[PDB]
Design a protein around this ligand. Structure first.
Ligand SMILES: *[C@@H]1O[C@H](CO)[C@@H](O)[C@H](O)[C@H]1NC(C)=O
Ligand SMILES: *[C@@H]1O[C@H](CO)[C@@H](O)[C@H](O)[C@H]1NC(C)=O
Ligand SMILES: [Zn+2]
Lengths: 591, 193
C-alpha cells in the first residue's frame, strides 16, 4: 500500500517548500526594510512562484488516499496539505474574486469623508480618543459609518455569496466553518475534536465571562455622568462613540476617565531608561538573560548582526511595525522601531516570546512549522510581558531601589487597565463571531441583516446607537479584519490561552502568592514544562498540547476570574448603590 | 581545508594520505571548530602514533545532523547517507561553513537521499538513481503516485540559524592492519651538546 510511500511525497514537497518560502520571506523582509520598486519587483515574482508551486504540489496530492493511512504522525501532516481552497474551481472565479478585493481595499484605504479632515490612519483616533467633545465625535461616527457602509454593501454581498459558493467545492457548509476547521484534532477515541461544536464552547465560556464584565461595565457608567449628563443612560447602555474608539475594542484612552485613584499614577520606568545609560541593545541583553534563566537555549550569533534593532537615519524606508517575522531555515530576526520607552518594552518582551516559540519547533519539517491551532501562535508573547510587568521584576532589573513601597491601590488601578485592554473586547468579538456564524450558513437572510446586527449589539455588548440606522447600511463590514480575509476567532481564544498558560506555569513552580503578580524569574521547573509544550508545534494537536500544560483538554474560564481576584471584589464592594443589568428599550434617539 | 569544491553526503570522494609526514595534534585553522570529538584515541596522542592508510570523509550536513554521526544513535543521516561502525577508530572534525557557501539565489549543487530498501553497510557508497518502489505499484519512470525521485538537494542560506548551519565534516578515520607504517608524526627535539 502507500504506508511508507506517503513519507516520500511530503518530504519532497517540504524540501523545496523550505527553500522557496525563504526566498519569498527574504524578499518580503527586504521590501519591509525599504519600500522601493526594485524590491517589490523581486517580492511579487517570488510570491507568485511560491503560490504556483504550492498548487503544483497540492494538485497531485488529492489522488492519494487518506483513510487507509495508519501512522498518525503523517496523518496530521497530510490533512493540512490538502487544504487548497480556490484550486477546485476555475481561474475566472479567482480573477473576479481578487479584482473586487483589491478594489474594496483601495476604497477602504482612501476613505475621505468631510461634511479639519484627514485620511484613515492620519487623525483617526486622535479625534476619537484625545478630543472629549460630543459634537466632534457626532460627525466622526456617522460620516465614518456612512462613507464605507452604503458604498461597500453591494460589493460585500457578492463577496459573501462567493464565500458561500466556495464551501460546496471543498464540501463545507459555509465559509465560517472553514476557519473553524483549523482547530482540528484526530487520533484515538479521546483525541478527536469536532469543528462544528465550537459555538457551544464559545457560549459556555461567554456565560461565565459575562458576570465578570457586568460590574466592570456598570461601574464605568456611573462616573461618566460627570461629563455627559444628558447622554449617559442611568440604567441602560452607553453610546458607541463614547468608548474611545469607533468600535469599542480598545479602551486605552478611557483609563484617565475611569481612573480608580488619580492621586498616584501607575509604575513609570521611562525616565529611568535615560539617565542610567540604557540603549536599544542592552534591553534585549537583559530580556534574553531573563529568558535563559528559566532553562532556554541561547540565541543565534546572527541575531545580533542581521536584526535591525536601532532605526538608521541613512535613508532607509522604515515601516515601524513590531512583529516577529519567521523567515524560516532557523533564521530569527526582529524588525522593530526600538526605543527606551515602556510601550516599546512591552512589545520587546512580547516578540521575544514568539522568537523563543519559533526556536522550539524548528526541528520538525516546514509543514509542521506552525502551532497546534490559530490560538497558540500569538499567545506565548503576552505571558512573558505579564510576568515582566511585576514591580519585583523591575526592581530586580536595577532601575528602582529595593525600598519601593507597592500599595494595593497601585495593583488595583493596574488590573483595571489590564482588564479593560484585554477582556473588554471579548463581548465585541463574540457578537461579531456569532453574527458571522449566523449569516454565513443561511440562518439570517439579507432582509434582517442590520436589525439583527443591532439587536445582538444591544444584547451581547450592551451598546445603544445614538441615531437610528436602516438596513441599507453595511456597518459591520467597516472593520479591518472584516473587509479583507482575516480570521478573528483567534483573538477570543488567545485571551483564555494566556491566562491558562500563566496559571499553569505559576502552579508548577510552587508559588503560593498572588496569581496576577506571579513571576517565573529564576524558575527552572517551568522551563522544562514550557519546552515540551512548544516543541511539538503542529505535530501534536491542542488536545495533547494542553494535557502537558495544565492536564485538561478543554477551555477553562476559571483562570479568567482567578486572575482578576482583587478586581471582582473591588467592583462588588463599589457597586452597592448601582443597578446591575442592561436595558434594550432605552435609546438616545427616542424622541 | 582549502578546497574550492566539496562533494555531497553520499557521493563523497576518498583520498589516501600516505608516504608523507603529517602534523597531528595541531590542526585548528578556523576559529569555531564546534566539533573535535575523537573516539578511542586521545587528542594529545595523535603525534606519537604512526599510520599507513588514512581516509578523509568530507561531507556537508546540517547542524542538527552533526550529533547523529556517532556509534549507537539513529537519525536521518546515520541510516541512509553515512554511518560509522560501533567500534569506530578516528575523530570527527567539523566547523562553520556559512561564509563561502552563501548565495540567496539558490543552492542546488549538493544532493542527498532519505529513503532506501534497507539499512546502510559500514563505509558504503551508493550512487544509484532508481525509483523508490515501496508498495505493490510498479514504476516505469513516473513522477507522482507511488513513484518518486529519492535524490533531493539542500537549501543552504547565510542565515541558516545556529543549530542547523551547514557543517562541513571531515572524518579522520585511520586503518590499522599491522602493515608497515609510513606516515610519521612531527619529530623535532634537536639539541646537540
Ligand atoms: C532592495 O532595494 C535596494 C534599493 O535599490 C537594493 O539596494 C537592494 O539590492 C534590493 N534588494 C533586493 C533583494 O533586490
Ligand atoms: C534571579 O536572581 C535573583 C534570585 O535571588 C533575583 O535577583 C531575581 O529573582 C532574578 N534576577 C533577575 C535579574 O531576574
Ligand atoms: Zn494572547
Amino acid at each position: 500500500l502507500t504506508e511508507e510511500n506517503a513519507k516520500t511525497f511530503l518530504n519532497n514537497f517540504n524540501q523545496e517548500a523550505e527553500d522557496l518560502s525563504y526566498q519569498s520571506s527574504l524578499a518580503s523582509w527586504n521590501y519591509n526594510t525599504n519600500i522601493t520598486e526594485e524590491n517589490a519587483q523581486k517580492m511579487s515574482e517570488a510570491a507568485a512562484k511560491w503560490s504556483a508551486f504550492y498548487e503544483e504540489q497540492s494538485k497531485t496530492a488529492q489522488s492519494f488516499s487518506l483513510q487507509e493511512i495508519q501512522t498518525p504522525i503523517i496523518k496530521r501532516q497530510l490533512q493540512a496539505l490538502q487544504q487548497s481552497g480556490s484550486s477546485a474551481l476555475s481561474a475566472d472565479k479567482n480573477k473576479q474574486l481578487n479584482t473586487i478585493l483589491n478594489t474594496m481595499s483601495t476604497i477602504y484605504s482612501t476613505g475621505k469623508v468631510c461634511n479639519e479632515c484627514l485620511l484613515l490612519e492620519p487623525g483617526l483616533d486622535e479625534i476619537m480618543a484625545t478630543s472629549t467633545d460630543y459634537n466632534s465625535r457626532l460627525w466622526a461616527w456617522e460620516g465614518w459609518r456612512a462613507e464605507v457602509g452604503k458604498q461597500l454593501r453591494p460589493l460585500y454581498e457578492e463577496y459573501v455569496v462567493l464565500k458561500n459558493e466556495m464551501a460546496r467545492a471543498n464540501n463545507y457548509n459555509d465559509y465560517g466553518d472553514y476557519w473553524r476547521g483549523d482547530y482540528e484534532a484526530e487520533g484515538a477515541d479521546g483525541y478527536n475534536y469536532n469543528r462544528n461544536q465550537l459555538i457551544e464552547d464559545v457560549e459556555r465560556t461567554f456565560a461565565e465571562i459575562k458576570p465578570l464584565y457586568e460590574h466592570l461595565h456598570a461601574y464605568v457608567r456611573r462616573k461618566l455622568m460627570d461629563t455627559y449628563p444628558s447622554y449617559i443612560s442611568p440604567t441602560g447602555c452607553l453610546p458607541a462613540h463614547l468608548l474611545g474608539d469607533m468600535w469599542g475594542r480598545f479602551w486605552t484612552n478611557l483609563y484617565p476617565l475611569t481612573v480608580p485613584f488619580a492621586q498616584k499614577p501607575n509604575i513609570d520606568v521611562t525616565d529611568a531608561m535615560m539617565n542610567q545609560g540604557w540603549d536599544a541593545e542592552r534591553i534585549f541583553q537583559e530580556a534574553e538573560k531573563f529568558f535563559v534563566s528559566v532553562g532556554l537555549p541561547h540565541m543565534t550569533q546572527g541575531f545580533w548582526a542581521n536584526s535591525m534593532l536601532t532605526e538608521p537615519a541613512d535613508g532607509r524606508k522604515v515601516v515601524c511595525h513590531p512583529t516577529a517575522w519567521d523567515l524560516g531555515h532557523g533564521d530569527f530576526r526582529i524588525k522593530m522601531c526600538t526605543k527606551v520607552t515602556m510601550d516599546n518594552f512591552l512589545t520587546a518582551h512580547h516578540e521575544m516570546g514568539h522568537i523563543q516559540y519559533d526556536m522550539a519547533y524548528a526541528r520538525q519539517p516546514f509543514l509542521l512549522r506552525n502551532g497546534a491551532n490559530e490560538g497558540f501562535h500569538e499567545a506565548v508573547g503576552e505571558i512573558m510581558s505579564l510576568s515582566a510587568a511585576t514591580p519585583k521584576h523591575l526592581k530586580s532589573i536595577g532601575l528602582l531601589p529595593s525600598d519601593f513601597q507597592e500599595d494595593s491601590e497601585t495593583e488595583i488601578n493596574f488590573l483595571l487597565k489590564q482588564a479593560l485592554t484585554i477582556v473588554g473586547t471579548l463581548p465585541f468579538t463574540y457578537m461579531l463571531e456569532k453574527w458571522r456564524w449566523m449569516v454565513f450558513r443561511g440562518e439570517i437572510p439579507k432582509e434582517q441583516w442590520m436589525k439583527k446586527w443591532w439587536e445582538m449589539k444591544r444584547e451581547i455588548v450592551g451598546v445603544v446607537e445614538p441615531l437610528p440606522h436602516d438596513e441599507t447600511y453595511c456597518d459591520p463590514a467597516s472593520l479591518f479584519h472584516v473587509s479583507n480575509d482575516y480570521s478573528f476567532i483567534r483573538y477570543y481564544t488567545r485571551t483564555i490561552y494566556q491566562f491558562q498558560f500563566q496559571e499553569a506555569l505559576c502552579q508548577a513552580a510552587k508559588y503560593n502568592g498572588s496569581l496576577h503578580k506571579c513571576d517565573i524569574s529564576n524558575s527552572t521547573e517551568a522551563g522544562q514544562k514550557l519546552l515540551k509544550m512548544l516543541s511539538l508545534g503542529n505535530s501534536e494537536p491542542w488536545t495533547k498540547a494542553l494535557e502537558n500544560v495544565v492536564g485538561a483538554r478543554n477551555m477553562d474560564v476559571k483562570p479568567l476570574l482567578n486572575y482578576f481576584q482583587p478586581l471582582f471584589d473591588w467592583l462588588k464592594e463599589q457597586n452597592r448603590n448601582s443597578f446591575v443589568g442592561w436595558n434594550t428599550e432605552w435609546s438616545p434617539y427616542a424622541d | 581545508f582549502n578546497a574550492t569544491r566539496f562533494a555531497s553526503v553520499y557521493a563523497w570522494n576518498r583520498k589516501r594520505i600516505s608516504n608523507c609526514v603529517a602534523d597531528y595534534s595541531v590542526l585548528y585553522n578556523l576559529a569555531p571548530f564546534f566539533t573535535f570529538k575523537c573516539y578511542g584515541v586521545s587528542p594529545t596522542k595523535l603525534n606519537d602514533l604512526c599510520f599507513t592508510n588514512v581516509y578523509a570523509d568530507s561531507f556537508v550536513i546540517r547542524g542538527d545532523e552533526v550529533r547523529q554521526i556517532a556509534p549507537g544513535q539513529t537519525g536521518n543521516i546515520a541510516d541512509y547517507n553515512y554511518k560509522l561502525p560501533d567500534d569506530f577508530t578516528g575523530c570527527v572534525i567539523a566547523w562553520n561553513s556559512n561564509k563561502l557557501d552563501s548565495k540567496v539565489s539558490g543552492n542546488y549543487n549538493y544532493l542527498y537521499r532519505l529513503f532506501r530498501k534497507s539499512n546502510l553497510k559500514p563505509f558504503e557508497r551508493d550512487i544509484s538513481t532508481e525509483i523508490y518502489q515501496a508498495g505493490n505499484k510498479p514504476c516505469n519512470g513516473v513522477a507522482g503516485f507511488n513513484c518518486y525521485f529519492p535524490l533531493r538537494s539542500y537549501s543552504f542560506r547565510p542565515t541558516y540559524g545556529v543549530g542547523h548551519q551547514p557543517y562541513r565534516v571531515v572524518v579522520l578515520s585511520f586503518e590499522l592492519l599491522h602493515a608497515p607504517a609510513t606516515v610519521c608524526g612531527p619529530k623535532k627535539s634537536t639539541n646537540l651538546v
